[PDB]
Amino acid sequence: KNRDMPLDSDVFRVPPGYNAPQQVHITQGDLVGRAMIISWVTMDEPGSSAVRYWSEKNGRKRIAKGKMSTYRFFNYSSGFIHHTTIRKLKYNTKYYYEVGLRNTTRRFSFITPPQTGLDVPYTFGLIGDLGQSFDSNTTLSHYELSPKKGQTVLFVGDLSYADRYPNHDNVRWDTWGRFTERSVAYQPWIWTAGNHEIEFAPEINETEPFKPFSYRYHVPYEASQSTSPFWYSIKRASAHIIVLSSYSAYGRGTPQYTWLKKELRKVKRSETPWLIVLMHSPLYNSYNHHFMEGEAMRTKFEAWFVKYKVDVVFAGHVHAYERSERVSNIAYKITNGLCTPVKDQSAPVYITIGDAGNYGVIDSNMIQPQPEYSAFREASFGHGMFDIKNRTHAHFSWNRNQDGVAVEADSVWFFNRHWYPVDDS
Amino acid sequence: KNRDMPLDSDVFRVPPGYNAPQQVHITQGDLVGRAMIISWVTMDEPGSSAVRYWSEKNGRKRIAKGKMSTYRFFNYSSGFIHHTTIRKLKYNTKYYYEVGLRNTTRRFSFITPPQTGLDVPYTFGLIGDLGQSFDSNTTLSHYELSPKKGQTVLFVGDLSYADRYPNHDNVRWDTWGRFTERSVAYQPWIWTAGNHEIEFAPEINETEPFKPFSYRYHVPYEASQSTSPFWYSIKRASAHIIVLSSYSAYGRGTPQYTWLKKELRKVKRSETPWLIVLMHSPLYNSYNHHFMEGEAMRTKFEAWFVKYKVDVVFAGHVHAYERSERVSNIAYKITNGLCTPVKDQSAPVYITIGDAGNYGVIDSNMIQPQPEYSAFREASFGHGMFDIKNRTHAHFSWNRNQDGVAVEADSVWFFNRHWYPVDDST
Amino acid sequence: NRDMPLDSDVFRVPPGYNAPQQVHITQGDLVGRAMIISWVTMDEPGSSAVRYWSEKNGRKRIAKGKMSTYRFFNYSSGFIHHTTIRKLKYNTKYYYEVGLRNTTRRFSFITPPQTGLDVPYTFGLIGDLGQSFDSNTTLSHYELSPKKGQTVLFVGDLSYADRYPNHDNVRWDTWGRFTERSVAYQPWIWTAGNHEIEFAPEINETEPFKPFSYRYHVPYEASQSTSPFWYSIKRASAHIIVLSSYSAYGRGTPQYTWLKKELRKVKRSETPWLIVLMHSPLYNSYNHHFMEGEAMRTKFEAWFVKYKVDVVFAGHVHAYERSERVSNIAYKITNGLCTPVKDQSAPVYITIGDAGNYGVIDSNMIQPQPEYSAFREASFGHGMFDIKNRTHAHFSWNRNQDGVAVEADSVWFFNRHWYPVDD
Amino acid sequence: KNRDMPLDSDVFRVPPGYNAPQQVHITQGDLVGRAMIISWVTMDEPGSSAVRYWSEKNGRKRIAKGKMSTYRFFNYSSGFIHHTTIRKLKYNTKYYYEVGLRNTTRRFSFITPPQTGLDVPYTFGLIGDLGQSFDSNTTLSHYELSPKKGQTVLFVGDLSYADRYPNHDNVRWDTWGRFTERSVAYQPWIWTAGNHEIEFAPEINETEPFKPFSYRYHVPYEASQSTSPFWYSIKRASAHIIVLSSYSAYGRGTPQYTWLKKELRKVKRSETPWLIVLMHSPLYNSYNHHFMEGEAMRTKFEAWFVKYKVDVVFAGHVHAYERSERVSNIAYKITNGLCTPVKDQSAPVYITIGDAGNYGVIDSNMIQPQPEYSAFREASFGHGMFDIKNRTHAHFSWNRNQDGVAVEADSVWFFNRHWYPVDDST
């Protein structure tokens, strides 16, 4: 049944004025937080890729110059896509920025994160598999209405679900951009590529994976010496965030494998104590839907996560919520019969948070009974919050669409694996 | 430690004459055997990409037109690389072909396979991780001197090992091309991409995986509707051969995953009864080196191989030889504890054959004791032959470098999984 | 102002899902055994395959071509197809179909006879056509001609889309649909004029000839040219040389180099008629664009006389003119030799850029009429160059205001190689 | 006949050190002189495209990041070409810069021109058709030893003459770069494209006009809103310099035509009194060699030069020296018989200065007798100096290779067409 919001919905309204910038969105633009990638689309003509910005502190207006690009997908032709990086921003300060400098100007703002450090607090939103259904809209409202006040969204993939439409009707990317603007124009969303971003459709000569997503959503991948936008790293406040690609190559020797190996080695827990991994497809999942799809990546990387004491791994893909115990399944050797997950205080917690709404369908069927490795699971629409207090403590909470915005249906304290490895079960 | 043949070795000699074609090699150019891709390099000037060819019978000389390309890698600049496809050939006939039409002509020949069919005999050589060491030269000689007489080489990856040299010195691609010539200019080699072809080197700003390899070695990947040179299939005689890429994406919904799922559905066992899979990294491997590297691909494809009753999966990567029992390990569901390989008459035999020589090192360390799923393993240099007799029987043998060219240190009868699914254990 | 409106019948869209539109053809090789088929699909990419067969018997074959797209400012093109059909039979009628996947449309052309000394043929002359009502009239007159044109030599300025805001490239699409009724059935030989340049740095479009060069291909490699803007073809008893007024032609440049070499290749005993096409006239006694042709004239005029070009057709000036056979090639800065003289080795220069443009005629002329000008008139119309045999060609000019059979100006061309009599 | 310096001449020496930058050259990088384009080649590996620079004043060392490129020409493959722009410099300041930051660093310096202004003095060298013959070397020496101290070279085209070699042996581009380094590394040379830069060679599939030149020599063309490296404008001191392309399109409506029309409108003689035009092919020329080749461009632009009262037009192409009277020939209407040049105080002086050496041949055949429009002409090798004193006066001198470096064989004072419009005839 169609639960996608109609094209004439209020959330899809086009900003008025000739060549008004639309689908405005921002993300972190460098490794440590001093830069911001500003992106938007113009529909009437190319327009200018310049961004005007200034801090509240200094009130000196400056100009950053960017780049415009376009793409085609089957018989769709995109508008004019702008990406511009503002650099050398001051930490912990409010900036205003304007786009559409030539015809119709629109102004927004954001706050740069504090400089990275050991005890620096920060609140991350967790959103997965958002889509553009009425549920999607409710989750977005709950997030923006949260008393916890999220400062940056960690997005675990499956953005627009445009690919569910005939020929992937790319108009549905445009609507998604206009819908999400109310949040992502004012705070960065950290992008992870899910399977709905693949858009491999050889039947209509579209054979370059991630094409629409990769034209529309840029990431600071060169900042961490990644050679691809689909895996990369950022540091923000006290968190070191590693973004992975479930649908890229990760065999031994491949670019993603090589990069992750080196990146984990570069992590300094005395500088960013919170080590967080994002990926679309969950390594631990006890739901019927996509059961065991995460197995391949798990066999490659799980031992690295345990060895480097990753604090937490976030994923989506399953349209529900699940939180694992700290467990590992890394003792297997084909013939030794050691294929059962065991408690391991050195392993991350695996959280599945792909329940922001998608196209309005929840994954309710669960493998019964709940396995030992699963601490909490529930088939409900909602979003998460990962609220870092200091180097030892972070509080995670899950909020359900059917609950008040201030209500936590699940919550748990994370004790840091490097600085405070006490049983946080 | 350096057991690579020196640059001035006889196998590396440059063919004489102004702009003489060198590094000549061919491979199947289409889905069923009526085409051939002809490839070669000219060093002095671009030269012609035209190929003259004719059957020894008829003798009507024809011209095929191809394309020239070049590439750079760090401070290396390639010579001029030619790829030309000859099409609409007659089955089971000898053709002569010539390259260097403008200046120094060189002439070679090949024999097209018989048309695909249920009971068409054919002999495949199996060579993996060849490299260019003295051991490499020995393995090649054994293959070309085999009384079995291989008609096509299935190459399971790791070609030149140029990436071991400073800045991957691509000269060592050129030397490997000239060293091969004696063989792959007269019979096709079916290429699989190994980890030594990846050549991911961001430290010298070379970040495109498979670049040198993909410029030098073309495969007929569009013929099987693949969107990439790194996975594809061909039919030859009674065999349907599926080539996979261990070092490309294979997650659910990815191009390779999607392609393979569809491709298996196209397999017709009444026309090609022998279903053969090539990949670089072994799904079953009981050597310590690279132990369990194949697990990721195994979780994705193993159940598929059993479902479609693949006869045999060949791989290289580990520098040794191994032959599994017919087993499967596809019953695991995380908490059911079903994680031990069991005997499964629907499953392929897995053979590791990455011992053609590489840079002169063997992998001798093995998991002890030998696991139940492992039938035979030995750390020696060599190559295999897969000799199809008919729709029910194929004979596989492994020849060691230290033995006479006619000695099989291991040998086994494959009973076809579709036409004759009887226990063929050893 | 005078341009036909978007809802005009001539701009009508062929019905049916992804129906091929803007179909046009042109010679695809050096001597006539090939044809370039071009068209546009708007609904989706579609197939670039062309099905074709000869009326006689007719085994159906398929030729596969290429699809392309482009952007110009805020305009995005449809899916443009170009496909070459090769190895055709001479002097035979062929049918061809495009849009094989969804909506097929069928057309036809007739290949020319093999090239030869005495092979007859009739060429239409059309320049600066545009899409005004005048334009539509000219096209009608040409197609209703009793003399029956078999190929159009087009001397430049096609759609005049560059007159619209941001060169509204939709106006290229309409011109394509407009001209289809003629150019889908017989080749037009394309010359590049100044309205094809489309140099518009103010909207970041700085590649000359961009839209023109995507929509209209020419067989330039067939004569070893390295550019579509200059090339030659042979058809029946004619050798036709197409030059580019708005490309470089300095000594040593590609075009200059190619022309010098191309003239050495002309064989008057295979193709006695040597025809040159260019947009901007070397001889012109109208005020508009007076003397714009001088630069090219100083470079190529002596060559045209040396190789005894029969006739040079140009457009650009929106009127009709025919010169005497004169040359002005003796000037040496200080020697006072700067007047054109009768020269029986020289071509006749014909200005024929009066097919309609955007509805405006150039009527202001230099007075009195110079010696070198034989005939000139400010009327809309088109020409016909009718080759009878190696000695005689008949050229005529038809005015839009006359009956389709009426020739306001008419002249016999006596071949410069086989019959160099004063005409 | 071969008078080109041999490959092992001292002037072609390779700078010592691994990956040592060579063929270093600089030119103005912006409209008004606050920028500089730094160019160099590395032969061993790509290297860094970063330039380190600081003023003799403070400094305050800074880095500018550039770009690397390469090309092939037939069977030639280039080294790694770096172009890096340094911006926001101080006027009238000596700067040091270094290239080759990663392995072998080399250090140079330049002096930024003073801010543009009415009476700003400045000395331009004029060199055309240099080549790499022994004569070429003598001319460069005379320029650098000149008592007048050239501060910037206006170069009227025909650089290396590499195209005279077999397949245009591009190695002769590398030699010419090493030879000219001793001057162009320390002061900008302002490039004009000549016929020897076209390098149209279809017979060897090189069909892109100016390819090697355009890769090796960059100009700040976007600063004057040109859309091509081949025509562009700069201001330097009291001069506004317009560079044109004899071998690009210039018909009505073409990019160069449109650009030049608009550029002349932008000229302000109240800010830059000296209006100078550079082009390769002379509009006025009384030598037999290339007689009247300039006629095509003359017909297009001559009237514009008169209309805007250009002070002086410099050209090369003809291998000799010539200086015209102020003449115009713009009244011709085909039939009216007005086709003789006449004295026109509103017109530029036309100077032919393509006598720096080429491949060792001088053009000595002149049309006799000397025409009225020609003031002075002589067939000797040499170079010119255009020495601006203030808004009204500029001194032009011509120095011959057979004379002392201090001797002026031809000499004339220019009266500025805007600020001192009085007959300056000799």
Ligand SMILES: *[C@@H]1O[C@H](CO)[C@@H](O[C@@H]2O[C@H](CO)[C@@H](O)[C@H](O)[C@H]2NC(C)=O)[C@H](O[C@@H]2O[C@@H](C)[C@@H](O)[C@@H](O)[C@@H]2O)[C@H]1NC(C)=O
């Ligand atoms: C979008 O903004 C442009 C300026 O950033 C407008 O161009 C300008 O229009 C002005 C009218 O107030 C005019 O004086 C300026 O010269 C001109 N500036 C330019 C072209 O750089 C543009 O206005 C439209 O386009 C111009 C060229 C004219 O056609 C106007 O009549 C148009 O309104 C703005 N576009 C629109 C559609 O608003």
Ligand SMILES: *[C@@H]1O[C@H](CO)[C@@H](O[C@@H]2O[C@H](CO)[C@@H](O)[C@H](O)[C@H]2NC(C)=O)[C@H](O[C@@H]2O[C@@H](C)[C@@H](O)[C@@H](O)[C@@H]2O)[C@H]1NC(C)=O
């Ligand atoms: C790091 O953050 C923790 C979570 O906010 C701090 O714990 C909290 O400390 C409060 C007193 O400052 C106390 O009222 C709260 O109950 C407590 N929260 C929890 C969930 O335990 C933590 O404070 C230290 O450790 C706690 C357990 C107490 O021992 C405090 O006295 C300590 O200050 C913060 N650590 C530091 C070094 O501040």
Ligand SMILES: *[C@@H]1O[C@H](CO)[C@@H](O[C@@H]2O[C@H](CO)[C@@H](O)[C@H](O)[C@H]2NC(C)=O)[C@H](O[C@@H]2O[C@@H](C)[C@@H](O)[C@@H](O)[C@@H]2O)[C@H]1NC(C)=O
């Ligand atoms: C396929 O090839 C096999 C090996 O060439 C055939 O088996 C062999 O038959 C020989 C006489 O033809 C016999 O002496 C060999 O012992 C035997 N070889 C082996 C390894 O079994 C096979 O022939 C059929 O099946 C075998 C088991 C016997 O029953 C034969 O009599 C059969 O013809 C060949 N199969 C077919 C269908 O051609």
Ligand SMILES: *[C@@H]1O[C@H](CO)[C@@H](O[C@@H]2O[C@H](CO)[C@@H](O)[C@H](O)[C@H]2NC(C)=O)[C@H](O[C@@H]2O[C@@H](C)[C@@H](O)[C@@H](O)[C@@H]2O)[C@H]1NC(C)=O
């Ligand atoms: C791109 O191709 C689509 C078909 O593959 C177009 O949709 C089809 O339009 C048909 C009428 O031409 C209509 O009957 C079909 O229902 C429809 N097919 C599907 C699967 O939706 C699409 O057309 C645009 O949108 C449709 C719904 C109509 O409004 C058309 O008039 C529109 O052009 C094509 N899109 C574009 C931008 O061309």
Ligand SMILES: *[C@@H]1O[C@H](CO)[C@@H](O[C@@H]2O[C@H](CO)[C@@H](O)[C@H](O)[C@H]2NC(C)=O)[C@H](O[C@@H]2O[C@@H](C)[C@@H](O)[C@@H](O)[C@@H]2O)[C@H]1NC(C)=O
């Ligand atoms: C080429 O075609 C010309 C035009 O038809 C021929 O001239 C015409 O010949 C007619 C006899 O068939 C004659 O009545 C006409 O007067 C004449 N038309 C013109 C415009 O002159 C021409 O015939 C040759 O040359 C002319 C001058 C006469 O000498 C004829 O007798 C000749 O046959 C044709 N030339 C050739 C080579 O056939």
Ligand SMILES: *[C@@H]1O[C@H](CO)[C@@H](O[C@@H]2O[C@H](CO)[C@@H](O)[C@H](O)[C@H]2NC(C)=O)[C@H](O[C@@H]2O[C@@H](C)[C@@H](O)[C@@H](O)[C@@H]2O)[C@H]1NC(C)=O
């Ligand atoms: C502009 O530069 C001219 C060339 O240098 C100056 O002329 C020269 O002035 C010298 C002393 O200043 C004098 O000895 C030279 O003969 C003379 N050179 C020439 C070629 O005339 C010029 O100076 C002005 O005009 C000259 C003729 C003298 O009358 C000076 O006294 C004047 O100042 C310079 N103009 C200015 C305003 O400085």
Ligand SMILES: *[C@@H]1O[C@H](CO)[C@@H](O)[C@H](O[C@@H]2O[C@@H](C)[C@@H](O)[C@@H](O)[C@@H]2O)[C@H]1NC(C)=O
């Ligand atoms: C155009 O031709 C192609 C190829 O023959 C057809 O597949 C199209 O059919 C349409 O799209 C397919 C995928 C299927 O949905 C069918 O029912 C549709 O009719 C055809 N396109 C149209 C619009 O006719």
Ligand SMILES: *[C@@H]1O[C@H](CO)[C@@H](O)[C@H](O)[C@H]1NC(C)=O
């Ligand atoms: C392009 O721009 C013009 C305004 O300059 C606008 O009026 C026109 O409709 C636009 N065309 C498009 C967006 O296709």
Ligand SMILES: *[C@@H]1O[C@H](CO)[C@@H](O)[C@H](O)[C@H]1NC(C)=O
């Ligand atoms: C989406 O949510 C916003 C904020 O709650 C609300 O104002 C708007 O009406 C909603 N739109 C739809 C279509 O649900």
Ligand SMILES: *[C@@H]1O[C@H](CO)[C@@H](O)[C@H](O)[C@H]1NC(C)=O
């Ligand atoms: C390689 O083997 C070949 C064939 O046996 C032999 O001719 C040659 O000498 C060998 N070359 C080297 C370097 O071993």
Ligand SMILES: *[C@@H]1O[C@H](CO)[C@@H](O)[C@H](O)[C@H]1NC(C)=O
């Ligand atoms: C290029 O070709 C010429 C012959 O055409 C040859 O003599 C020369 O050595 C070659 N140069 C290189 C480096 O290939």
Ligand SMILES: *[C@@H]1O[C@H](CO)[C@@H](O)[C@H](O)[C@H]1NC(C)=O
């Ligand atoms: C154009 O000309 C054709 C042919 O005479 C005629 O049928 C058509 O109606 C005309 N259209 C317009 C709008 O002039």
Ligand SMILES: *[C@@H]1O[C@H](CO)[C@@H](O)[C@H](O)[C@H]1NC(C)=O
């Ligand atoms: C070039 O001139 C310089 C300076 O006069 C001199 O030192 C050098 O030897 C000359 N080189 C030649 C003539 O090859």
Ligand SMILES: [Fe+3]
């Ligand atoms: Fe999802």
Ligand SMILES: [Fe+3]
């Ligand atoms: Fe190996």
Ligand SMILES: [Fe+3]
């Ligand atoms: Fe016109």
